[PDB]
Amino acid sequence: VRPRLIAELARRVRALREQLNRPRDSQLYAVDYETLTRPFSGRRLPVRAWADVRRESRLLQLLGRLPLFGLGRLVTRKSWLWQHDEPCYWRLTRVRPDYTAQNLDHGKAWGILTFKGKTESEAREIEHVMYHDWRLVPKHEEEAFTAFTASVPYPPLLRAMIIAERQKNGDTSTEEPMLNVQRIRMEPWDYPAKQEDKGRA
Amino acid sequence: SSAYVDSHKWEAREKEHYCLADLASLMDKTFERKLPVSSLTISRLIDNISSREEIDHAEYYLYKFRHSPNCWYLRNWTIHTWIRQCLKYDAQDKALYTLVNKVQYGIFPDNFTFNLLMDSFIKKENYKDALSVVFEVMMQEAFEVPSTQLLSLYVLFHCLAKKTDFSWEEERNFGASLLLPGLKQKNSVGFSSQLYGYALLGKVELQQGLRAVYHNMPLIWKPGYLDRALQVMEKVAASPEDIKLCREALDVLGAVLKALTKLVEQLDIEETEQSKLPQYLERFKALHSKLQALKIESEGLLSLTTQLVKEKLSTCEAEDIATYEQNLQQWHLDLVQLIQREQQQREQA
Amino acid sequence: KAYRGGHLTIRLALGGCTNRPFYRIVAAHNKCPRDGRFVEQLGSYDPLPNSHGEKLVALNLDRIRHWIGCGAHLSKPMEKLLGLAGFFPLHPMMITNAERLRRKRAREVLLASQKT
Amino acid sequence: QPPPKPVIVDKHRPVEPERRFLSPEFIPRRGRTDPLKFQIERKDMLERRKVLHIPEFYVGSILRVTTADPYASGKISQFLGICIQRSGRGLGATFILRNVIEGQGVEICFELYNPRVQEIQVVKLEKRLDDSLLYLRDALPEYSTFDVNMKPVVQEPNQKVPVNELKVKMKPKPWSKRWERPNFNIKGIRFDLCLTEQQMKEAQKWNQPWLEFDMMREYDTSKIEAAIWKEIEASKRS
Ligand SMILES: [Mg+2]
């Protein structure tokens, strides 16, 4: 068998060069409000976020106006609080801005979160940081805002099949078959995801 | 308060006495190789600075630090080294430019340091300077401190001494700044200033919409500023002492002048403020009549009442000084560890 | 042909000459072509009526359940047919289509009653 | 939103005070003529110097030059190169530059008083053991290959001349100038690999010790350079 070395060489070189000089998060997140197109991509924004990007600012842009980017300060998911009346927030623990930015308006930061008062005992990562859908809640009116408080039949053919099965088995079991639905935790769309799972240009 | 403004400990405590030129060369090489650099370099530099050109060198070295691989550290003691090194050599326009464009600098002075700064500003007796600076304090949102009385004095004096009729940026800034100083829940001065700030914010809304109310400014998004003002007035009438001034006259003037004859952020079912104006004026006159039926001398000058605050101001300045010495002790404690840490690299080498 | 990532998918394969489509429910990978290779042929479906007028469709219940337990995603038409069969829940988009058709029929009947 | 700014200071009492440095082109040649020629040409080049800065340099230094050329993209010509030599006196004095690009080793002769040049810049300031480095044509290209976009290596504002003590490998024997001879007094090259003891010892037969022992051909300069400095300072004050 004949080996091949230039393939591995080019692979290693490309990996090193891209991990060295990857595009900056601030650079590839920057948006021009005149045309609404991200540089380095030439792609247009969605109609639902057009106005949000035109008007509202970004997470780090908001957090740049207070020391240390406000450790523990109230930042709430505008989308969550417009989709549901219940309060939802982010217990931001760690922060790291991108220094290449002039206004320091981009970076990575996260901690514990809560959804409908459901606290999580793990400081996991935020989702959709670069959106212009971030609203800062001051420390006044804080506790008032943070205040917070069977089974289904089987399908007809499936239950008929189980009926025939247990009839051949011999048991009567006139009870209608059922499954647990409270165990099935149907999760709303807005439940966050893991950033590291999704890649990056 | 000369004793409050003076502090010989800071200027005669922990001077590095390193060569400004050598520190500058080290910083330049480190920012050439663009690897992260601790704040020890800039701190020692600033502590050694004794010249105008050298304060400028530190200024754009702070530029370079903001643009350096590390920015979150943001050491208040280094910030105050810089502030003292600037304000002892009296770079007024420079300090003003920094405090206005802090987004490029990233300076965030704490209560006592800012109080010393504003006391020097008093000593030099400039008004628009202090006005822009207290606007930047409003931006900072740091008002639960002994400097709240100084902020209150400044705003209560400047809102009267301004005499500028139509300016939307300035008037919105006044309306937004007149809230946070009064949040310490003290007296008529406090909650009536909150009321007048609600009124000014509602006026800015009615004249230029709710967008600017929050776009470049952290505010609450409820449009009913006039409704909240009416709530405040009626709850005050229901419930102490209420020393009032004729700013209610300006409130009435604004209400009546607005009663006189694109993105849709308002909700459809709910009413629009343009259509709420009539019942707003109705309930405003009703609450006015109720308050006059119920304190309404309307003679006590608001800036004069801040002179009575000087008593408890001079009381709380003691606790402020004490907290400042506590901060100094904590800094001298945690900072000495960082010098032996820098020696750890040389020991490893 | 080892496809990176991807996932098995029970979906419809097309057969028959033009103007005579004949679908076949069959398990295959997400990356395979329309008539590409498969794993196990599961069932068939004729969208045309026979001499009796009814339309033909076949399901392999045990094997389909085994494939689903092993892990296989479903395509909207095949799970629509399953929900119509009854082994599977009914389709909400099917409910909406039915409701829309009934709304439009009522509207047209109302317009006809107005015209007459 | 002004940009940042660079500075470099250095205040060491024994190290920083480097007193004076003269250009090799103000000085005249041993030849005989009226000093009036020299002094008028000198004041001319000095009243041009008032415009043009000439960040001083040496042989083995790297210069980036921008000049106003009629036939070029934007009518400007930019060139980076190593200083091989500085030759000539008066206004017509020139310096050579060299660089390897696209496998071709190119060299230019830039005159430092023609208005056609717009600006010159010292990317690096160092000094080599050899007075003239025109043997880099026979040296390997990898010693001469330099980047056009390499940034300026800013030197401290007042320090001694950095002298890189190194050697150079060369292309094999078929050389154009026969550098192995002792007439040239060169040391950057490496005889130990470029030739043998036999060849070196056979080339040092042309050696004559007496050239340096002589004292009538040597050229004293102290008074001349002193008068030159004095006239330069007078022109500066004026
Ligand atoms: Mg030749």
B19 contacts B4 by C-beta, under 8 angstroms: no
Chain A residue closest in CA terms to B220: A137
Pairing of strands A134-136, A75-77: antiparallel
C7: Cβ–Cβ under 8 A, 6 or more apart, which residues?
C29, C30, C71, C72, C73
Q: Which is nearest to A57 in space by CA: A37, A83, A94, A31?
A: A31
Contact between residue B137 and residue B114 where contact means Cβ atoms under 8 Å apart? yes
Q: At a CB cut-off of 8 Å and minimum separation 6, what does B74 contact?
A: A67, A68, B106, B108
CA of D136 to the centre of ligand 1 (A): 14
Asked if chain C contacts chain D via 3 or more Cβ pairs within 8 Å, the reply is no
Distance between CA atoms of residues B315 and A76, nearest Å: 39
Interval between CA D178 and ligand 1 midpoint (Å): 9
Chains D and B touch (3+ CB pairs under 8 A): yes
How far apart CA B200 and CA B206 sit, in angstroms, is 10
Burial D204-216 (b: 16+ CB within 10 A, else e): eeeeeeeeeeeee
- DSSP state letters, A20-47: HSPPPHHHHH--BTTTTEETTTTEEPPH
The residues with which C10 forms a beta bridge, in sequence order, are C27, C74
Cα of D187 vs centre of ligand 1, distance in Å, is: 21
Cβ-Cβ contacts under 8 Å for B24 (sequence gap 6 or more): B45, B57, B61, D7, D8, D9
Out of D3, D4, D8, the one facing B24 most closely (by C-beta) is D8
Report CA Rg, chain D.
21
Chains A and C touch each other (3 or more Cβ pairs < 8 A): yes
Determine contact, residues D188/D167, Cβ cutoff 8 Å.
Answer: yes
Q: What separation in angstroms does the CA of C37 have from each of B16, B275, C12, C16, C26?
A: 77, 67, 12, 16, 10
Partner-chain contact B20 D6, CB within 8 Å:
no
Chain A residues in contact with B103 by the CB 8 A cut-off are 64, 103-104
Which of chain B's residues have a Cβ under 8 Å away from the Cβ of D157? none
CA B251 – CA B291 distance, rounded (Å): 14
- What distance lies between CA B70 and its chain's CA centroid? 26
**Which residues are within 8 A (CB) of C114 and not within 5 positions of it... i.e. 6 or more apart?**
none
**CA nearest to B65 within chain D:** D4
Residues with Cβ < 8 Å from D130, sequence gap 6 or more? D59, D60, D186, D187, D188
Classify C3 in phi/psi space as left (phi over 0), alpha (psi -120 to 50) or beta: beta
C-alpha span between C94 and C88 (Å, rounded)? 13
Contact B109, B77 (CB under 8 A): no
- D176 C-alpha to ligand 1 centroid (Å): 4
**Alpha carbon of A153: minimum distance to chain C alpha carbons (Å):** 11
Please name the residues between 128 and 167 in chain A that touch chain C, using a CB distance below 8 Å: 155-158, 161
Q: Say how far apart CA D230 and CA D238 lie, in whole Å.
A: 12
Closest CA of chain A from B228, distance in Å: 14
Q: Is A115 helix (H, G, I), strand (E, B) or coil?
A: strand
Interface test with C, best of A154, A157, A161 (most C CBs within 10 A): A157
Chain B residues touching residue A65 (CB < 8 angstroms): 139-141, 218
B22 near D CB under 8 A = yes
User: Which residues from B are below 8 Å from D9, CB to CB?
Assistant: 20-21, 24-25
> How close, in Å, is residue B306 to chain A by CA atoms?
24
CA of D40 to the centre of ligand 1 (A): 38
- Mind telling me how many Å the CA of C28 is from chain A's nearest CA? 25
Give CA separation, C106 vs C19, C98, C109, in Å.
33, 12, 5
**Which residue, among C87, C88, C91, would best test binding to A if mutated, counting the most A CBs under 10 Å from its CB?**
C87
Helices assigned H by DSSP within chain B: 2-5, 8-11, 20-32, 40-48, 52-66, 76-88, 92-100, 102-105, 111-124, 128-140, 148-161, 168-177, 188-208, 211-214, 225-238, 247-259, 273-293, 302-348
Cβ-Cβ contacts under 8 Å between A and B: the total is 44
Are the Cβ atoms of C88 and A155 closer than 8 angstroms?
Answer: yes
Number of neighbouring beta carbons within 10 Å of residue A126: 18
Residues 82-141 of B with CB under 8 A from D: 101, 104
Ligand 1 mean position, distance from CA D213 (Å): 31
CA of D146 to the centre of ligand 1 (A): 25
Question: Please, which chains are in contact with A (at least 3 CB pairs closer than 8 A)?
Answer: B, C
> CB distance B25–D4 less than 8 Å?
no
The number of CA neighbours under 13 Å toward the Cβ of A80 is 21
Q: With beta carbons under 8 A apart, name residues in chain D contacting B18.
A: none
CA distances from residue B206 to B11, B214, B219 in whole angstroms, order as listed: 51, 14, 16
**Is-contact C94 C83, C-beta < 8 A?**
yes
Outline where chain D has alpha helix (H).
35-49, 141-144, 191-194, 197-203, 210-213, 222-237
Please tell me the distance between residue D32's alpha carbon and the centre of ligand 1 in angstroms.
32
Calpha distance D39→C73 (Å, rounded)? 94
Subunits with 3+ Cβ pairs within 8 Å of D are B
Residues 142-201 of A with CB under 8 A from B: none
d(CA A140, CA A159): 57
Distance (angstroms) between ligand 1 centre and the Cα of D174 equals 10
Name the β-bridge partners of C23. Answer: C14, C45
Q: With an 8 Å Cβ cutoff, are B183 and A99 in contact?
A: no
The three-point CA angle B230-B236-B238 to 5° equals: 105
Resolution in Å, one decimal place: 4.0
**Sequence letter at residue A122:** E
The answer to whether residue A94 neighbours chain B at the CB level (below 8 Å) is no
Give the end-to-end CA distance of chain D in Å, rounded to a whole number.
Answer: 40
Cα distance from N-terminal residue to C-terminal residue, chain C:
65
Q: How far is the CA of B77 from the CAs of B117, B169, D142, in angstroms?
A: 15, 33, 51
PDB experimental method: cryo-EM
**What single-letter DSSP state applies at residue A110?**
E
Residues of chain D contacting residue B104, judged by C-beta atoms under 8 Å apart? 1
CB distance B127 to B163 below 8 Å: no
Q: Which sequence spans correspond to the domains of chain C?
A: 1-115
* φ and ψ at residue A42, rounded to 5 degrees: 60, 25
Q: Name the residue with tokens 């804080």.
A: A142
Closest Cα in chain A, distance from residue B347 (Å): 30
Q: Which residue of D has its CA nearest to B56?
A: D5
